[PDB]
Design a protein around this nucleic acid. Structure first.
Length: 122
RNA sequence: GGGGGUGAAACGGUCUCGACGGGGGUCGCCGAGGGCGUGGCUGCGCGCCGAGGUGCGGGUGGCCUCGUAAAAACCCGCAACGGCAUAACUGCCAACACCAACUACGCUCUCGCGGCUUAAUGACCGCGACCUCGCCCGGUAGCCCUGCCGGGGGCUCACCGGAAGCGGGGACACAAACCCGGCUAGCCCGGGGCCACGCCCUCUAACCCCGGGCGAAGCUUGAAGGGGGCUCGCUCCUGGCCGCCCGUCCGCGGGCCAAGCCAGGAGGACACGCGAAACGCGGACUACGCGCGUAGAGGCCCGCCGUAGGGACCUUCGGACGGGGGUUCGACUCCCCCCACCUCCACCA
């Protein structure tokens, strides 16, 4: 059911800032939301790649049958404007202020989007 | 096994606006702290010979080059030893109050009685002793009742002296290196005019004060006034000299005048500008004889739309609905149709 979001973020790790970004899914990953296959623990933004990236996210597909149970962990790029990014990139790197997926959602224009908050231990 | 039914949180949401790259471009948010250089100015650069050296420099211009000249440099040093020698250049052993910052059988000489009572001495803390020693007294020197006087006022542990009054003891732990008391609260040698919009000898206040002296020395009888003195002219100011001269530097030119002086007025005493004041017509830029334009590692500021000569964002695209083509304002669910998927469909039976 669609209100899947990491509910640790008020009793485990605090959040000091929040940003918005997308990630390249596929529909079987989205179609997970109706059942509930998702938590965001162990998943954080990273850099080592030239683009900013997001990895380790257990979306864990559910369609109807078997259709396309792809690995959900995979690296997907984070577009995340230079006005934000060149005021935050070390937070992504140095992990005491990890930009982490709190929730994934579909936005104003059909795109899979991720809410990124400043966590640690996440 | 396919179709219809299903392939976002249904059906109905297909660039991740972006990070990061690149087409059309901005020069901005973000890297780039605005940036970046083709300049300007020295009233053209130079002078009658001059400046100047090859890794980075000391020395050298008497060696020796570049300057319309007639052909191409050196001695020494940075450059010595990582932990180590002299080479690191004659390395280099450490600091507070003993009689007391901190700690005692203590400390300038013999003892005692309780405290202390857990625990040892009854020297500890409170208390009593032939005496150190204070209170304060017998003294050299050096010092603020320094008037006359009552009286060396008296002293300092450097060097010494009693018992005529004790604080308390074998520590009971730094100011008589200047002070108490009365009669005229004074007298004598003597310097010398400040004071009031500058005063004084002078005068109503006899004419002088009283700063200092007397144990270790020197500047003030005056309010109403002037003739004269002081610092000049009692005091000030009138004309003759005062004051003033265009980047380095030059031709044809050169004046009117306080103060201070030579002298004369006016207010009772500086009354403060009574007025009386001041450059023109021109010019080279190594001085006109002479040439090179580098005597040369310049002195001080700006200039340009414009960053090419540091990056990469605005717009926009490499990159997501399990594929792969057409196609709607709205797609994988309109038309397809492979694979999947729930139900229906195609041997035989």
């Amino acid at each position: 059911a669609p209100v899947l979001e990491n509910r640790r973020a008020r009793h485990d790790y605090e959040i000091l800032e929040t940003y918005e970004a997308g990630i390249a899914l596929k529909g079987t990953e989205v179609k997970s939301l109706r059942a509930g296959k998702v938590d965001f623990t162990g998943s954080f933004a990273r850099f080592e790649d030239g683009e900013l990236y997001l990895e380790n996210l257990y979306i864990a597909p559910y369609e109807k049958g078997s259709y396309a149970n792809v690995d959900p962990r995979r690296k997907r790029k984070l577009l995340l404007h230079k006005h934000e990014l060149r005021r935050l990139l070390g937070k992504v790197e140095q992990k005491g202020l990890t930009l982490v997926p709190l929730k994934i959602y579909f936005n104003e224009r059909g795109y899979a989007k991720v809410l990124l908050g400043l966590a640690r231990g996440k």
